[PDB]
Amino acid sequence: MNKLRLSVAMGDYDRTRPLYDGRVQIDGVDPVFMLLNPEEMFFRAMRSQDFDITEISFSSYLVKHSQDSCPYIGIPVFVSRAFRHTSIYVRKDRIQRPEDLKGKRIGLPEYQLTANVWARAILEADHGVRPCDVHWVRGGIETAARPEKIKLALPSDIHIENAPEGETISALLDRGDIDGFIGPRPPASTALRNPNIGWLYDDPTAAAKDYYRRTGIFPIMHIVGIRKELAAQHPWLPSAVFKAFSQAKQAALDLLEDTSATKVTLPFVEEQIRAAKSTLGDDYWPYGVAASRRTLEAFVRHHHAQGLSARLMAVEELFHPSTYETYSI
Amino acid sequence: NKLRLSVAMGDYDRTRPLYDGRVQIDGVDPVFMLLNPEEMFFRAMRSQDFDITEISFSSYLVKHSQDSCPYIGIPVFVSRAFRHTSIYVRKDRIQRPEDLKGKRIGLPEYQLTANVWARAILEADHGVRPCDVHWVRGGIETAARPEKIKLALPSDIHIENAPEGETISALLDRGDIDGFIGPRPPASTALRNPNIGWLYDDPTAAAKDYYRRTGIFPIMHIVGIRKELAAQHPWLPSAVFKAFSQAKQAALDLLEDTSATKVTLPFVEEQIRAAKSTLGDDYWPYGVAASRRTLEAFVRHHHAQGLSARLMAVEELFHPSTYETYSI
Numbered sequence: 001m002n003k004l005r006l007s008v009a010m011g012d013y014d015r016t017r018p019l020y021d022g023r024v025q026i027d028g029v030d031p032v033f034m035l036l037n038p039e040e041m042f043f044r045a046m047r048s049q050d051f052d053i054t055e056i057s058f059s060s061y062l063v064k065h066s067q068d069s070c071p072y073i074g075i076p077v078f079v080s081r082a083f084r085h086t087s088i089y090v091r092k093d094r095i096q097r098p099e100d101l102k103g104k105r106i107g108l109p110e111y112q113l114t115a116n117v118w119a120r121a122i123l124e125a126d127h128g129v130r131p132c133d134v135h136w137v138r139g140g141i142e143t144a145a146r147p148e149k150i151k152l153a154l155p156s157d158i159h160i161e162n163a164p165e166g167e168t169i170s171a172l173l174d175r176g177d178i179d180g181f182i183g184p185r186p187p188a189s190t191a192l193r194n195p196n197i198g199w200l201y202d203d204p205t206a207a208a209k210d211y212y213r214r215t216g217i218f219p220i221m222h223i224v225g226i227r228k229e230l231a232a233q234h235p236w237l238p239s240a241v242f243k244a245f246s247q248a249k250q251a252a253l254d255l256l257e258d259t260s261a262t263k264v265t266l267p268f269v270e271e272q273i274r275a276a277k278s279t280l281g282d283d284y285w286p287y288g289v290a291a292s293r294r295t296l297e298a299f300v301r302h303h304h305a306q307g308l309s310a311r312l313m314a315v316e317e318l319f320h321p322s323t324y325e326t327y328s329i
Numbered sequence: 330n331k332l333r334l335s336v337a338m339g340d341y342d343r344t345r346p347l348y349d350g351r352v353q354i355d356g357v358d359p360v361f362m363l364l365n366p367e368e369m370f371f372r373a374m375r376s377q378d379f380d381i382t383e384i385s386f387s388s389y390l391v392k393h394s395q396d397s398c399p400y401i402g403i404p405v406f407v408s409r410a411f412r413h414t415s416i417y418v419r420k421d422r423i424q425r426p427e428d429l430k431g432k433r434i435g436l437p438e439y440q441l442t443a444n445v446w447a448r449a450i451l452e453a454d455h456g457v458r459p460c461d462v463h464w465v466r467g468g469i470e471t472a473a474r475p476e477k478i479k480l481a482l483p484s485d486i487h488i489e490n491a492p493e494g495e496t497i498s499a500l501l502d503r504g505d506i507d508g509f510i511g512p513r514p515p516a517s518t519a520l521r522n523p524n525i526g527w528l529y530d531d532p533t534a535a536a537k538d539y540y541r542r543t544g545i546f547p548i549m550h551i552v553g554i555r556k557e558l559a560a561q562h563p564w565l566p567s568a569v570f571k572a573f574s575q576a577k578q579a580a581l582d583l584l585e586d587t588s589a590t591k592v593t594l595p596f597v598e599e600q601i602r603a604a605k606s607t608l609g610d611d612y613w614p615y616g617v618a619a620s621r622r623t624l625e626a627f628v629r630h631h632h633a634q635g636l637s638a639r640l641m642a643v644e645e646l647f648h649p650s651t652y653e654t655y656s657i
């Protein structure tokens with residue numbers, strides 16, 4: 001009857017519902033859950049250490065983790081994965097092709113955002129548009145005032161100036177003070193209605209499938225974290241958490257694959273699952289290190305290149321030691 | 330003082346906001362139970378467990394056409410999907426759909442909502458009419474499975490039980506049957522047979538053509554309220570219609586946001602946009618007007634296939650108070 005009363009903060013996803021509801025339980029924990037949008041969760045996690053266990057920005061975690069001054073230790077539960085080709089909005093009236101973004105003004109909400117890292121990596125690795133080749137403009141998407149959640153020491157070849165106060169990135173794109181936009185959300189709707197704003201990539205699905213064939217990278221946005229002290233005091237707690245989230249994803253996938261009635265409000269789910277399994281592999285959204293090696297390997301590289309890691313991190317130091325492998329029968 | 334009602338629905342994105350209280354039913358204190366379709370419809374039709382329940386559109390229509398269904402429907406279509414994916418065949422025998430004339434197709438029960446849409450495709454598009462087929466009925470996962478309600482099928486429909494103890498899935502695996510239709514694919518052991526797969530090589534493609542041609546986004550499930558309840562509380566149909574409506578809007582609001590994709594799929598952003606393109610902004614519509622072509626076709630097929638006792642008019646499908654909602 002004696003368990004750990006911990007707070008747990010995650011998103012509201014199919015892959016977390018079975019946790020939320022108790023269908024999946026955490027060994028030796030009595031959870032207390034709060035379901036949060038990413039923005040709220042990471043702001044609070046990084047500046048306030050609200051939670052015992054929390055979903056976190058992979059980027060932000062790495063910033064603080066690279067300096068051994070992060071309150072949390074990560075586990076390889078990738079509750080957020082997604083290609084971020086869809087992440088890049090441009091003024092189609094100006095930009096014909098990605099290479100045109102050299103020496104333009106791109107806006108982002110904060111530089112160190114996980115999606116932004118993957119996005120800048122695409123622009124570098126396959127259009128030659130390097131961070132330093134861009135006038136960066138930082139300001140909110142919906143609300144005009146938005147800080148960098150953690151302080152950065154970016155190399156000074158990265159030119160970066162705040163948005164005019166009171167004006168969002170969304171607005172600045174609308175008026176075309178910036179030529180481009182990257183972040184985890186599209187620009188605000190008023191902006192979206194401008195006929196001249198749209199994805200850089202005309203066919204993001206196609207470009208991302210190519211990317212994946214080329215690199216084997218299914219970008220990771222979010223990991224999960226536990227307070228350092230907690231992991232030290234309870235050496236089993238990392239593994240326990242890893243398992244639960246793992247089970248929850250399996251439970252949700254079990255439900256999702258059933259076509260008696262499709263569990264998301266989309267058409268063609270049957271077809272999608274099978275296409276996903278075809279392009280990515282049966283375990284298309286894997287948790288776990290080995291199963292994500294290419295992606296992890298790339299992240300540390302990009303993170304260090306883009307100027308957010310102290311030194312170039314080793315996959316081997318990214319997570320709590322007890323989580324680089326799970327048992328099998 | 331509210332109405333203590335039991336509510337039985339599936340566990341979908343579009344029902345979560347109901348389940349967890351985010352969306353509430355006017356004047357009701359709901360007790361929710363999340364059920365797989367098979368269990369829910371079995372219980373709903375044969376023992377009237379629930380005050381409000383998701384139901385087989387087909388089943389409901391069977392009992393509703395005889396004016397002796399305990400429930401009255403509302404146009405909350407918590408289950409929609411194309412059922413091109415619904416037809417598995419032995420690819421080694423059936424090269425194209427027309428080959429199914431005079432073959433043995435297996436199904437779990439004849440009256441099943443997806444089966445109706447499926448037989449309609451085979452008729453409307455390949456000339457394979459119900460009567461042209463040796464039907465075999467047995468479970469997919471368990472061998473013994475009753476027809477939920479009695480049917481008076483016209484005698485041109487030849488239909489026999491599966492060899493006792495054997496599932497449809499097995500029967501397809503051994504190739505005692507050439508074809509299979511149902512809301513679920515055959516069991517996995519069967520699925521491993523390299524000779525089994527979809528009739529349609531590109532179901533998505535065929536369905537998008539179908540939709541261009543007909544404007545039909547098949548409905549599987551509606552929602553239902555006990556007759557007495559609707560009579561005693563003339564506002565209760567409308568209230569329920571709204572709640573489910575809001576829950577779907579809430580879920581769609583969450584799903585469209587790309588901060589983190591709420592389903593475990595890749596490319597959700599792209600999917601949504603494609604779906605909206607082919608189907609319309611309200612790609613998964615509740616409500617009658619927005620579903621007219623689909624509703625129209627259903628009653629037709631249902632009556633053709635021999636499951637409607639009377640001619641049904643779209644106008645008598647749902648409780649009268651739900652043929653329209655207000656607007657600002």
Ligand SMILES: [Zn+2]
Pocket residue numbers: 057113114115184221
């Ligand atoms: Zn981020």
Ligand SMILES: [Zn+2]
Pocket residue numbers: 366385386441442443512549
């Ligand atoms: Zn059904």
